[PDB]
Design a protein around this ligand. Structure first.
Ligand SMILES: NS(=O)(=O)c1ccc(C(=O)NCc2ccccc2F)cc1
Ligand SMILES: [Hg+2]
Ligand SMILES: [Zn+2]
Length: 258
């Protein structure tokens, strides 16, 4: 039936309703640090989240999204491998049932506990919907989460999860500052790819940060208490909502550092 992460509608079944799953530039991929090409012509990233306006947080049955007002250039991403300005529209995570898995991208086959995706769309396209019809329509900033010490900036998110336990639930979420989620270094790897969930459109320029942020065990534990199911239905814990690494094919992962 509708796609999911279970035995019968998981990633290995997606190709049936979304043929693009077997495309040439699918994500995520495994980043082989030794094969990545250091490209000095890559500019430094420019993240301007000082005027970010968060609106709400919702459980959409696959993960939880924190949405932002993208009607104006409040929070933007520029620099790096990007041309033009990209607006932040939402951010979400992918996580596992155990600390040893959860991320979508892997580094030298190493899986992290979770992965943060900050989704942006190219302003040149007018709206998100048009942007997804273009090879350079989106830019996703990926950040790995390793279990260790608590991340203060993530706590506001952790505290509201109870209100959005089940599919379709949403809660007002204003004044959240996304800058509290960034590692201290902005070094990154970049490659052309796609959305990691259906429709799996190959409209994304992936920018994966080298330095992971650390979060406490108790923080990720709360992610695991979310439900895939809607209220009243049988309980299916929201865990392992990650897609396995896809073949790199004829693409090159570039690094902004040596
Ligand atoms: N995990 S990830 O690659 O960062 C990712 C980012 C955004 C979306 C999204 O906006 N989906 C809804 C959607 C997308 C395109 C067309 C119609 C939709 F409803 C999905 C996955
Ligand atoms: Hg596209
Ligand atoms: Zn994602």
């Amino acid at each position: 039936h509708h796609w999911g992460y279970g035995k019968h509608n998981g990633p290995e079944h997606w190709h049936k309703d979304f043929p693009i799953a077997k495309g040439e530039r699918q994500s995520p991929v495994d980043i082989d640090t030794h094969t990545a090409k250091y490209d000095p012509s890559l500019k430094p990233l420019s993240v301007s989240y000082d005027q970010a306006t968060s609106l709400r947080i919702l459980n959409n049955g696959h993960a939880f999204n924190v949405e932002f007002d993208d009607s104006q250039d409040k929070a933007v991403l520029k620099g790096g491998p990007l041309d033009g300005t990209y607006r932040l529209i939402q951010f979400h995570f992918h996580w596992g049932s155990l600390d040893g898995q959860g991320s979508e991208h892997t580094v030298d086959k190493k899986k992290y506990a979770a992965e943060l995706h900050l989704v942006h769309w190219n302003t040149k396209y007018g709206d998100f919907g048009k942007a997804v019809q273009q090879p350079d329509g989106l830019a996703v900033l990926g950040i790995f989460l390793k279990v260790g010490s608590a991340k203060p900036g993530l706590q506001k998110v952790v505290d509201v999860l109870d209100s959005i336990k089940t599919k379709g639930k949403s809660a007002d979420f204003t004044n959240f500052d996304p800058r509290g989620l960034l590692p201290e270094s902005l070094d990154y790897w970049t490659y052309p790819g796609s959305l990691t969930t259906p429709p799996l459109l190959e409209c994304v320029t992936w920018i994966v940060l080298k330095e992971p942020i650390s979060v406490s065990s108790e923080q990720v534990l709360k992610f695991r208490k979310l439900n895939f199911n809607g209220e009243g239905e049988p309980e299916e814990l929201m865990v392992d909502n990650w897609r396995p690494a896809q073949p790199l094919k004829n693409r090159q992962i570039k690094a902004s550092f040596k």
